[PDB]
Nucleic acid binder design. Sequence first.
RNA 1: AGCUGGUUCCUUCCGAAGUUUCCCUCAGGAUAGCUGGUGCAUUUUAAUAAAUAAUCUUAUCUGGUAAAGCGAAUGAUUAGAGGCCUUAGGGUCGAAACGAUCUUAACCUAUUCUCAAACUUUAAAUGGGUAAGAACCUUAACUUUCUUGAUAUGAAGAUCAAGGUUAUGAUAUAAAUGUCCCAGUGGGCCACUUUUGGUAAGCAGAACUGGCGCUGUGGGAUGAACCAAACGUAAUGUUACGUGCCCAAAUUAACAACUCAUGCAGAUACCAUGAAAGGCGUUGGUUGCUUAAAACAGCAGGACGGUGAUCAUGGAAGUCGAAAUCCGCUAAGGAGUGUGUAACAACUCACCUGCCGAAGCAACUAGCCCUUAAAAUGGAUGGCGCUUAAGUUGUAU
RNA 2: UCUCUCAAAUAAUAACGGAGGUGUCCCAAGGCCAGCUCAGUGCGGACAGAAACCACACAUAGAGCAAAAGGGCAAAUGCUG
RNA 3: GAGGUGUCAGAAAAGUUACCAUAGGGAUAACUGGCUUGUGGCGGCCAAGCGUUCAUAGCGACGUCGCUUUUUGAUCCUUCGAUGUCGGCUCUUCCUAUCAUUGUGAAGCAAAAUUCACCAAGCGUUGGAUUGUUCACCCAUGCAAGGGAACGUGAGCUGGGU
RNA 4: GCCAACGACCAUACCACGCUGAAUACAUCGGUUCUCGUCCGAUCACCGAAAUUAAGCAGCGUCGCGGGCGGUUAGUACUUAGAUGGGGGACCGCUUGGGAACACCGCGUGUUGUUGGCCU
Lengths: 158, 217, 182, 290, 75
Amino acid sequence: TNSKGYRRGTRDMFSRPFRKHGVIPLSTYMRVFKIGDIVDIKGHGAVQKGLPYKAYHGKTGRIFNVTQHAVGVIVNKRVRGKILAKRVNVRIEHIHHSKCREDFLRRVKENERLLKEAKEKGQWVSLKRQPEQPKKAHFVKKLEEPIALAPIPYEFIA
Amino acid sequence: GRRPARCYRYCKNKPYPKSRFCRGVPDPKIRIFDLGRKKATVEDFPLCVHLVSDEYEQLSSEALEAGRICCNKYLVKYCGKDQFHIRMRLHPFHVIRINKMLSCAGADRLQTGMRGAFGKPQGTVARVRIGQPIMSVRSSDRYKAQVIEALRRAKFKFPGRQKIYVSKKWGFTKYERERYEELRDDNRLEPDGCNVKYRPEHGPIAAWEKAQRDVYA
Amino acid sequence: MAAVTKKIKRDPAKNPMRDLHIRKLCLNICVGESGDRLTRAAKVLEQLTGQQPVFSKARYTVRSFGIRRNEKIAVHCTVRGAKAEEILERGLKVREYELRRENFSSTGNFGFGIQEHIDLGIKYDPSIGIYGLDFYVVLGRPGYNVNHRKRKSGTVGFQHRLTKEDAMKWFQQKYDGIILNT
Amino acid sequence: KNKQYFKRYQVKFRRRREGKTDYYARKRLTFQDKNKYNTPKYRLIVRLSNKDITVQIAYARIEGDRVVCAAYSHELPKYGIQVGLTNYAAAYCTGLLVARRVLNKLGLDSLYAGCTEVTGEEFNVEPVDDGPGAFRCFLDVGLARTTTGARVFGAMKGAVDGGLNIPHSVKRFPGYSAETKSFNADVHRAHIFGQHVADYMRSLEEEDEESFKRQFSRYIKLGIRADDLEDIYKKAHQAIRNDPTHKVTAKKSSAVTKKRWNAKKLTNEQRKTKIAAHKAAYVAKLQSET
Amino acid sequence: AKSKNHTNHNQNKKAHRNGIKRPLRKRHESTLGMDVKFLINQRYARKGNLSREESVKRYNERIASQKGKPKPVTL
RNA sequence: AGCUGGUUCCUUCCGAAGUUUCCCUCAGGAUAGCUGGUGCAUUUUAAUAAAUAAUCUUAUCUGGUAAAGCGAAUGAUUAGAGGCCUUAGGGUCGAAACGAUCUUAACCUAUUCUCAAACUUUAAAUGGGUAAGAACCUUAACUUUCUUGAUAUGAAGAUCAAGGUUAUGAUAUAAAUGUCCCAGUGGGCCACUUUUGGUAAGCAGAACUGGCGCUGUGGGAUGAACCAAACGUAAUGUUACGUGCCCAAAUUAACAACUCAUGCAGAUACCAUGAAAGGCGUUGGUUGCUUAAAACAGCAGGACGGUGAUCAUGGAAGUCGAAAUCCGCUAAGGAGUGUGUAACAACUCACCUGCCGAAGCAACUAGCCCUUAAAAUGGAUGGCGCUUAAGUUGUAU
RNA sequence: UCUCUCAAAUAAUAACGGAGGUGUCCCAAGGCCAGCUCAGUGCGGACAGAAACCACACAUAGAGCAAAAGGGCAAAUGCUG
RNA sequence: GAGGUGUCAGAAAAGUUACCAUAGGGAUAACUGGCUUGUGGCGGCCAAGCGUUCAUAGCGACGUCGCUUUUUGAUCCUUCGAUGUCGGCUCUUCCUAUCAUUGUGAAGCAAAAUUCACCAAGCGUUGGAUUGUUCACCCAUGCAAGGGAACGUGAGCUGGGU
RNA sequence: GCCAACGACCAUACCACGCUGAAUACAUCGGUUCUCGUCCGAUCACCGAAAUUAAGCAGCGUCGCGGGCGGUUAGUACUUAGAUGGGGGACCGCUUGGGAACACCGCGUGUUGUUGGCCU
């Protein structure tokens, strides 16, 4: 009957992968973590204090507490069955800022530029992101010679 | 003596190595994977002819023995022992397990019914893939048919359709039948033991000096 | 192995400050039992250099050599500067300046083993009972600091590096020692 | 040994290969309380180099460590100490140099004037009541040797007396009688003013005068004998307070060649042709041989 | 009489029926595990703020008379 | 009495679960999940969005499976080749040699063979988190008996001002929320896919998902579950599965092959079985041959001599077997493919010829059929019957 | 109750599935700091041989950290004060 | 805070019932049938060898593919508000993988004789000693005393074993 | 460029074998009163006088050893999704999406933050 402890299956979760071996280098702390910023939790198993319990590895939350040597990140974790909210106190040695958020911020500044540029052009804005549409009337010039070549196959050979 | 091989013909299970966890595995019945004039320079026997499996099945060590024995006997008897390199490119490092039905003396009490049915290790099997080479056999160009006939008779000892392909490759060396002539009729290949050493360029000047001098001398 | 090397037109390339000083001569008396015999063994080192010998505990229970772990099997003293030179020369005579070409290590260091320590000074004093000596002389290059040091630890040399040949040459020079092949 | 070993060798960071930094001491020294968010912590870093005493205030950032003040003992001939820039004395002066230069650019001159009479007494600089609290600086020795009587700590005493709040127990300053503790305060002063350097002069000036001819020359050549050393170091302390010289460079600047000097990296066209020419020469040698 | 231990069969059907249901981006901000102190002077912050157009204007008038703070950011 | 049996009218609407946990619990409860009912608050998700919920996409994280690897750590392993080194243990030439030369071993090197669920650097797919804006961003400044700093900064609360288009895509059957602590359930069963134990099972047990449970109808002849499809009551129209007839429907007003079956020829997924291995049956393929100086089948005709050359002698001149194996004469004939006298010998085939003077021969591939393929009340493509099919493959109405 | 695997690369995940362990052990094998460099190998050193102590070079964790196993670690989390 | 219930979310607990009783259970054994077929039985494929010679007349290693379901396990679907154990007596019909008989092909079958294989179950396959016994083991005859399926067959017997 | 100190990322920085390193300098490298630490002033503590860029360190070279990245390998492997597709099964074609790895090949062999100095 079952699995259950805490460290179940974490041979490769807490594995430092080849040539990244040792003492967690200082840049990790140098990043200032501020309440409301989106953070990704990545289990570093060499920093054994403030360990993010195995379900929380690559489950990403927003910061609602900063404490003297822990960052309290609210990960919303799918239960059987009512999404309860968990404040997990985990260290910065395991906590890395999500640049999922920066994409949003880059957009505000870009949208404001496009808005201004368009307004000074008079018309028109259309700053909302449209995914890759079936494109265009494509002219291929030979140049550099007509095509043609067909293909295949003699693919025997065991 | 060990059931019969239908039960283990198919690759059903997560492959069991001869491991520090399996300890107790009976010795592989296959000892010698290379019988021949193995000591012959690659230039002497320019043919390779293969038996290649066209099926995802497992060939037993028991089957492998029999096929080797067939190949040796036909080549040695008709065409003299030292004219061939027989390499069996299939080693049996997967362990067959049998849960014997231990009730002894119709006496039961604790038996073991299906409970716990843990297989003990009885046997060794090679796991074989479509276009995996079973046999590779080296010969001189006048001994083509004799190689092929030896291979034909080895097929039957093994479960599930195998076919003979005559490789355009010079022996056990990778080089297609043009390519080792391009290299050995220049200065570029020098002899290793059933193989050839490179033709390098890597590396670099110091190594190149010597190689060029050795062929020329 | 493959260089645009040259040996550029600088002028001669001698051998300046890096010349060959002696790191330590460490003497050991190895006695298979502790108690009184070990203490008596200590007397022999202690008087010779004047410097008090330190003891090191048995790593393990070998038992075939009838030793148990942390028995305090044997005593040794390391000697550096002035007293190192005098004691080395004294034991050299006892050994005969005829060593062997092996006695020599690739880190250019050399050893003797001698019986009768009484040959180099030390009165017979019959309560102490005659002890053989192990000589290991580590030769270094003056300013060996680099590969020893706690902060700014660097790995020695091209040239520097003491070899068997370098150490045998130094031996041949001063002391006029015969390298003597068995 | 072996192609094979080199592959799996996960060889130490970078400064562990240079043996300068163990990284373990570095973790503890830098690692801020996270609930002190963007605050630059303040490390005093002392390295003893065998003719510089270099004391720098540094902080960590994600791009690299940022140094706010740097003092070299090669700054001390301005303040009149031409000689013994390896000294205990020169350490106390270099520590005062950093401390004061830190207080000069960062406007804390009038408050926190640090132990002005320098009586070597065991004082960490007390926070001035109803004033914002003075620079808390932390000792990075790194791998520097945690040794009683070190110039590492002679610099720290001088930095404290320069006004900085450096938490330290008194043990690692020079002259502390181990059995018992028992802080000898006279001895503490003597190291500052180079009296010990001067004692080295005085005793052997009668006896073994080989050592003058060698060691502690320049003191002959500038007429600064033994008793005069005490005054130069006391008046270097006054001169450092007075002036922060800051140091400016007007140079411009050649990255390229001058003269030899970086041997312009042998183009792929050059390498290949040379390699062919070797194979060409080897064929030529064998033709001569035949 | 071997029953069956553990099927997660139909659990995921069950969940989507009446939704597993994400809560809220609370503009009215929840607390717990804030190191007691912030909370104490957060309480004081709210209180001391009493309201406010004159309060900001009087302290702006202080900052122009004082000017103030070249020292703080560099230390 | 937690057990078994039974429980008394109807219609309408919605509609389960055999799972979680704990329990002398495991034939049962409680509990959570699923279920209904009762409603409530607001609908730019509301009555004449710049607020979301949750699915794609996008952007931003995670992972050690599949695969790959072993000349990458760990764990297994095969083959030669080349070698230092006295590390050699034997020998030969040596009294002996750290002498020359073989021989064989530990290591060492570059290759090479083969593998892992309890190995993995590497490393997918499919998965799982967070974001895609007025609950946003940016400018400016207030409290701080704190945390905190030589900062009444930062960190929050937060006041004030700036902003073209609200800043992926479909949608919302309106959604969220509360009460009942509600029943019913706590015995599951089956299939695709993935899998563990087991030879296996209509077997025991997971992962994901759908059914069945609670589901007929049409279809699979039949059938709880497979297919198609979810059913108010009817007309008319059209589909899935089929179309000789049974049985609604072209023995097609189309078409090209394949197959002829003496004892389950064959006849629609699941599926009610069929192989390993064979076939100069038949059918289409692939490759290599002999050859106009007449070939290939098939007759005619030589098949010897140097020389019982010779070793096995038990007997072998060619031939129970073999080291071997070349000349000569030549058109060509193996010191020999067999038949066998115990031998000699007589026969044979290669080799070359007379005729044949232009076709054919060998080794492979795989369809149907046949062999393999035998079992028991009489018997089953579901039936009749079907052979240029009503079979089998493909194709068109 | 716990590790590794099963477990199908988030997490969850069962069988009388596989390989195993837990009821204790410890004032350090806790806590902290300083110094050190181990597994293993090469080479020297009477007594010393393959292994004793002494000495140097190399060496990504191959050791050691009570114990099961798997993670982690090299001026340490190990070892020694 | 400690002392503890290891059935470890926490009863305080020994046997036996073939003298038994009840409430139930095909959620569950024994037993018929069904799946399976390792194990059993029967039949092949390849062929190293046996066999004077000559691999296959008759045989056949090491291997390997099946079929049968009549061995025995594995299972528990159905049956426990009852499906009448085993044998022997009696009586049935079929099946072959044919021992005999018919007609035949093989043979290292000369004759005699037997062995192998085929179409074939139309027709035989028995009388006893002992065992409860199928099975087994023996005796005797006849050219020959083949093997299986409906766990056949207890309102048919017997009740001998169980 | 170089050098220092302090560092980030973390082998393009390692390894191996040579060559070279001017100047402010690290280093090489010396002395042992004192403090202090060591069996030993090797380290460590101190004094900084005489030498030297050989080494560390740095750079430069190397068809090296290793390490990075891209292609190549390979749309293969593998796999999601589908069929009243095939095959006796084992499994396998097709069809809609996604997509490796070893290897081989090419090209690089530390870059850069702060702060001070030196500049060939």
